[PDB]
Structures are given as C-alpha cells and as structure tokens.
C-alpha cells in the first residue's frame, strides 16, 4: 500500500500510496504447447462485435 | 517534524511540519465590539458585538447572532 | 460598520447598537 518516491521532486511528498494495494495484470510468456491452442482455435472462431 | 515515513533526501517543506509555540496579542474593547482573551491556549481571542443596554433597545442577540424579529416590535395599533 | 443609508435606523453609540420605535415611521 505505501511506497516511496525514488526521485525526490521539490514540493512533492516522498510518500505515495497505491489505491488498494492492488496491482493486477502480471503474467508470464507462452510455450510452444500453450501456443498451439490460441492458434488452433483462433482458426475456428470469427470475431463479431 | 516529518509528516510521513520519508526516505533520505534533501529538505523539502512539503514533507516537514513546522512546530510553532504560542501567541499573545493585545486587544482593547471597541465602542461596538467587546474583545476577550489573550490568544493563549484555553484563553483564546474572542469577540462579541456589544449592544446598547438602553431599556427600549428592541435589538437583541440570541446564541446565533443579532435578532430583530417582527413579533416584539410595537407595531401600529 | 453601519450602512450610512438615509433611513438606516441602526445607529452607533459609545455603549452599543441601538434602535427605537422613535425612528420607525409607522404610517399613522
């Protein structure tokens, strides 16, 4: 939740807060087998809006 | 006094709160305003508008300020 | 400060603010 400002800027507090300590969105790369699907499946579906 | 748990760095007024001490001023009651107190803790500077204590002074002062309502006025009769 | 209007009944004395029916001009 509570982090610091690495570069001290004049007139700005050096203590920032994350909003809910929520950092969402991290993940890893793909292998050759996780990629067959997501390929051999983007070939069966046609997007639609 | 540091306002927050702050990392090393140069002094910045946005991170430090200045510690004052106290303050004593001089006040004199005016012709229409009464002053009380000296500004110290527990003895703060306060003011209140003083009205004429003339018996027929319809003007009065409740706990919310001056009042002159139409009820107590000797309307024509 | 009291508004110096011609018919402003509010007047300032050494004791305090005063208003009296003497100034209030009932229509009689």
- Print burial letters for C1-28: b (CB count within 10 Å at least 16), e (below 16): eeeeeeeebeeeeeebbbbeeeeeeeee
Is the distance from CB of A5 to CB of B12 less than 8 angstroms?
A: no
Is the distance from CB of C20 to CB of C11 less than 8 angstroms?
A: no
Query: Distance between CA atoms of B3 and B21, rounded to whole angstroms?
Result: 18
- Comparing CA positions, the residue from B38, B2, B5 lying closest to residue B19 is B2
Residue pairs between chains A and B whose CB atoms are closer than 8 Å: 29
- Scan residues 4-23 of C and list those with Cβ closer than 8 Å to B: 12-21
| Cα→Cα distances C17→A40, B68, C3, C13, C25, Å | 92, 12, 13, 6, 19
Experimental method reported for this structure: cryo-EM
- Print burial letters for B59-70: b (CB count within 10 Å at least 16), e (below 16): beeeeeeeeeee
Q: Looking at B1-77, which runs of residues are DSSP E strands?
A: 33-36, 46-49, 60-62, 65-67
Q: Which residues of B touch A10 (CB under 8 A)?
A: 12
Do B and C count as touching (3 or more CB pairs closer than 8 A)? yes
- Chains contacting chain A through 3 or more C-beta pairs under 8 A: B
Q: Could you tell me the resolution of this structure in angstroms?
A: 3.2
Q: In the 8-state DSSP scheme, what is residue B40?
A: B
Q: Is the dihedral of CA B30, B33, B37, B38 positive or negative?
A: negative
Coil, helix or strand for A23? coil
């Amino acid at each position: 939740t509570d982090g610091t400002l690495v570069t001290p800027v004049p007139g700005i507090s050096s203590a920032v807060t994350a909003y809910g300590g929520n950092f969402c969105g991290g993940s890893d790369e793909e292998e050759c087998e996780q990629f067959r699907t997501r390929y051999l499946q983007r070939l069966q579906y046609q997007p639609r809006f | 006094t540091a306002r927050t748990d702050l990392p090393p760095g140069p002094f910045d007024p946005a991170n430090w709160q200045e510690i004052s001490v106290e303050g004593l001023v001089e006040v004199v009651d005016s012709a229409t305003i009464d002053f009380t107190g000296t500004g110290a803790a527990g003895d703060p500077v306060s003011a209140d508008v003083k009205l004429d204590p003339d018996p027929d002074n319809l003007l009065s002062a409740t706990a919310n300020g001056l009042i002159l309502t139409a009820d107590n006025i000797p309307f024509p009769d």
